[PDB]
Amino acid sequence: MNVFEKIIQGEIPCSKILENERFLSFYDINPKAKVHALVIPKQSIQDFNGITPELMAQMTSFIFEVVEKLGIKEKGYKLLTNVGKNAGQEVMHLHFHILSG
Amino acid sequence: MNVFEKIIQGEIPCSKILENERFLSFYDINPKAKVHALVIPKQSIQDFNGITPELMAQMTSFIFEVVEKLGIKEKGYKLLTNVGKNAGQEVMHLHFHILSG
Ligand SMILES: Nc1ncnc2c1ncn2[C@@H]1O[C@H](COP(=O)(O)O)[C@@H](O)[C@H]1O
């Protein structure tokens, strides 16, 4: 019932960059940088506070795969996640912004 | 030889928020938010690209401890790290910015 959950469940399309049994990455429809990707856990979790360390290890691994696929790994990129509406979170599913440019 | 490495060693003082065997947190001397903390690995690592997943699991755990000590865990916060000079990294030691709303 939420925009990223809809993507996970395949209700709405996206520009998929990379996908894993536990994670999914895709382009942001309103880019804030030359390359702007989003990395999300397929599991239903709302923000960074609700991710286990074990899973963030696997996400870190997945993040390296994304930035390397995008070819910005060595050029340089920003890693960002907003925890809660007061820190600017708009969609309530854990997601990391990857920007480079 | 570098400003955060000096803090780790402990050549220059800081406003230590929390510390443990592998990580250290402290306030940023030029805040960009009401609460602005930095989380750094004591191990000599330059940026996010050079952290192992295993260690980022333990850092995630450590990050939860700092935001809860700062009392912004539930109010809301931003998590940011810059990878490389081209993404705005100024100090060349892996660090996560924790900003508050
Ligand atoms: N249908 C969608 N597909 C891809 N990205 C989206 C969609 N709807 C919103 N977004 C992005 O998700 C982000 C929401 O902001 P935030 O919650 O602060 O990370 C924004 O950067 C939006 O551009």
Swiss-Prot record, chains A, B:
Alphabetized Pfam families for the sequence: HIT (PF01230)
Cited SUPFAM superfamilies: HIT-like (SSF54197)
Gene Ontology molecular-function annotations: adenosine 5'-monophosphoramidase activity
UniProt GO cellular component terms: cytoplasm; cytosol
Taxonomy, superkingdom: Bacteria
UniProt GO BP: D-alanine catabolic process
Residue numbers covered by motif Histidine triad motif: 93-97
All residue ranges annotated as the HIT domain in the record: 3-101
Name of the protein this chain belongs to: Uncharacterized HIT-like protein HP_0404
Lineage: Bacteria, Pseudomonadati, Campylobacterota, Epsilonproteobacteria, Campylobacterales
